[PDB]
Design a protein around this ligand. Structure first.
Ligand SMILES: Nc1ncnc2c1ncn2[C@@H]1O[C@@H]2COP(=O)(O)O[C@H]2[C@H]1O
Ligand SMILES: Nc1ncnc2c1ncn2[C@@H]1O[C@@H]2COP(=O)(O)O[C@H]2[C@H]1O
Ligand SMILES: Nc1ncnc2c1ncn2[C@@H]1O[C@@H]2COP(=O)(O)O[C@H]2[C@H]1O
Lengths: 101, 99, 98
């Protein structure tokens, strides 16, 4: 298994493309996005991104860039969880996530 | 970053308003909810609720499970998280960036 | 609360039924699945499974069987998180989750 940080961004859908580009620019290998409802008839339609990064610093770069640019004007939350990646050709590279010495 | 508990509730879609009302009464500052499938495929719902304290998460969990989960299908679990940005979650005080 | 392992599988939607068969065959008590979008405009419709297991080996058996059968030919990521289950009759049994 490979150590990973899982960054979650829940925010307004209008920010989809701008947050996707930030993610791409960060060096993150991929991301998952989903339509969600949220509250912070009072529910609103939101999107949630999940991004697995190899380092906490990469996760924080994305979080910091999204927030500084958009979180004054747009609703949002960003949080981070620990995870271990078991399989993922781009995340772990060709030798896989359980390579030996 | 501010320590958080991420409470997740996966249950029958018909309980959406009922469960949102409990979350709204709890003191939690928000919630995300999404349409999902499952078995435990039926179309159901998943809530995620970030709370500042484990105690708030567990009060939500207890209230929801006792009121509904002997009569409706449901699972409730909790994960650790850290909040990096969140105006209402961390307050005007911010997410204590240097801790 | 009962310690649990949260296995996540994000992969191509066409594999929905093939993966669900594997989850069931592993002994897992259930799963959640949802429609997602992934990059890895260049977002393609895909699926995410979340599976809570009592043991780490059960989660890894699901992981190993899905990846070996499919990940040479289909895109995917599988990762794992700690969790605790608070309520869940099938997960915890009739005594509850403590
Ligand atoms: N405490 C929380 N727990 C879970 N989700 C949250 C929390 N606070 C805010 N959110 C999500 O972040 C979203 C921000 O935009 P909305 O307020 O439309 O809806 C909010 C919720 O979906
Ligand atoms: N062990 C598990 N892992 C992930 N999801 C679960 C598990 N057990 C139950 N569920 C989810 O919780 C839901 C409760 O309603 P269902 O029985 O319709 O469908 C269930 C699944 O989506
Ligand atoms: N680093 C990552 N973080 C979050 N999700 C990812 C990551 N890499 C791949 N994925 C997801 O795994 C999916 C595999 O199928 P796709 O390429 O269609 O889209 C991919 C993303 O949804």
């Amino acid at each position: 298994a490979k150590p990973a940080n899982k960054l979650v961004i829940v925010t307004e859908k209008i920010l989809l493309k701008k947050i996707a580009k930030i993610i791409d620019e960060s060096g993150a290998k991929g991301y998952t996005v989903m339509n969600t409802g949220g509250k912070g008839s009072d529910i609103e339609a939101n999107i949630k991104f999940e991004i697995l990064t190899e380092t906490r610093e990469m996760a924080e770069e994305i979080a910091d860039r999204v927030a500084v640019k958009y979180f004054n004007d747009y609703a949002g939350i960003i949080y981070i969880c620990s995870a271990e990646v078991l399989y993922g050709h781009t995340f772990c590279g060709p030798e896989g996530c359980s390579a030996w010495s």
